[PDB]
Paper text:
PcyA catalyzes a two-step reduction reaction: in the first step, the D-ring vinyl group of BV is reduced using two electrons and two protons to produce the reaction intermediate, 181, 182-dihydrobiliverdin (18EtBV), and in the second step, the A-ring of 18EtBV is reduced using two electrons and two protons to synthesize PCB. In the case of PcyA, three residues, namely, glutamate, histidine, and aspartate (Glu76, His88, and Asp105 in Synechocystis PcyA), present near the D- and A-rings of BV, are essential for the PcyA reaction. Here, we performed neutron crystallography and quantum chemical analysis of the D105N–BV and I86D–BV complexes to determine the protonation states of BV and the surrounding residues and study the correlation between the absorption spectra and protonation states around BV.
The D105N mutant, in which aspartate at position 105 is substituted with asparagine, was reported to be only approximately 10% as active as wildtype (WT) PcyA. Spectroscopic analysis also revealed that D105N receives an electron to produce BV radicals. However, because of the mutation, enzymatic catalysis does not proceed, as the proton transfer from the carboxy side chain of Asp105 to the substrate is no longer possible. In the previously determined absorption spectra of the PcyA D105N and I86D mutants, complexed with BV, a peak at 730 nm, observed in the WT, disappeared and increased, respectively. Our quantum mechanics/molecular mechanics calculations of the absorption spectra showed that the spectral change in D105N arises from Glu76 deprotonation, consistent with the neutron structure. Glu76 and His88 showed different hydrogen bonding with surrounding residues compared with WT PcyA, further explaining why D105N and I86D have much lower activities for phycocyanobilin synthesis than the WT PcyA. The neutron structures of PcyA D105N–BV and I86D–BV at room temperature were refined to 2.10 Å and 2.00 Å resolutions, respectively. The R-factor and free R-factor for the D105N–BV structures were 16.51% and 18.00%, respectively, while those for the I86D–BV structures were 17.25% and 20.82%, respectively.
Residue numbers in the entry: 7 to 247
The structure:
Amino acid sequence: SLTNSSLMPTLNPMIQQLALAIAASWQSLPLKPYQLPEDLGYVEGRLEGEKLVIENRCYQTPQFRKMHLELAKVGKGLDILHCVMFPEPLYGLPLFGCNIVAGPGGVSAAIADLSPTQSDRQLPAAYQKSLAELGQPEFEQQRELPPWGEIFSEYCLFIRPSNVTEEERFVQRVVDFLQIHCHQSIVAEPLSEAQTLEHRQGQIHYCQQQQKNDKTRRVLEKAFGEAWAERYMSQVLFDVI
Ligand SMILES: C=CC1=C(C)/C(=C/c2[nH]c(Cc3[nH]c(/C=C4\NC(=O)C(C)=C4C=C)c(C)c3CCC(=O)O)c(CCC(=O)O)c2C)NC1=O
Ligand code: NA
């Protein structure tokens, strides 16, 4: 639960709403804690510039090997939400991820996806069908994915929200993605060893590509330095199984 968070009250309102929605989706699942390296939960650091504060919450279920919700703030202005649900490869589910970045003048980036793990880069058919039924969402300011973003599905949303209506529409789309994903997790069957290996590789590739994101790395380096940032990206955020 988030009522004991020290960062929550100080974060951009869209981030607060989305954090609450993710927590509500997870709250009644068969959750167990997942221990991050060094049992990390709150961390703060500074070098010569602004302080970075991070709060981490992490869990697992039989179908999701690691469910990570991270809230962060740089200085007074830069607010971040990071969330990934890493699937257990045995069940073949896609990777849910989202990131919101906001400053004093509003949300600059809102990204969410259900990303594929199959070698053909397609989502399972049940997901394709359910996602197609939601309809194409209308947003005024779409952003093009960076080159390492070939890991994202055709349903990936990457926008700068233009107004509160778009903020709310984006949050609702993430809730819809999570409703689909949690339902599919109930009906998922354990796969063969060969198919498990295929899904494992797709997850490894997703993690290696996400480690190429210099926008994350520079924020971490400015507060903690190069070696800490590399450890954090490779062992805490995007760990290879
Ligand atoms: C400590 C955690 C953390 C930090 C410091 C972070 C920083 C961060 N991530 C992004 C962009 C940012 N983030 C993502 C996407 C993601 N990033 C993810 O971690 C996940 C799970 C996704 C997608 C599901 C993209 C694709 C981009 C745009 C990169 C670019 O423009 O080069 C920016 C630039 C925002 C803008 O251009 O408006 C910043 C400062 N993101 C974080 O999550
Ligand atoms: Na506009």
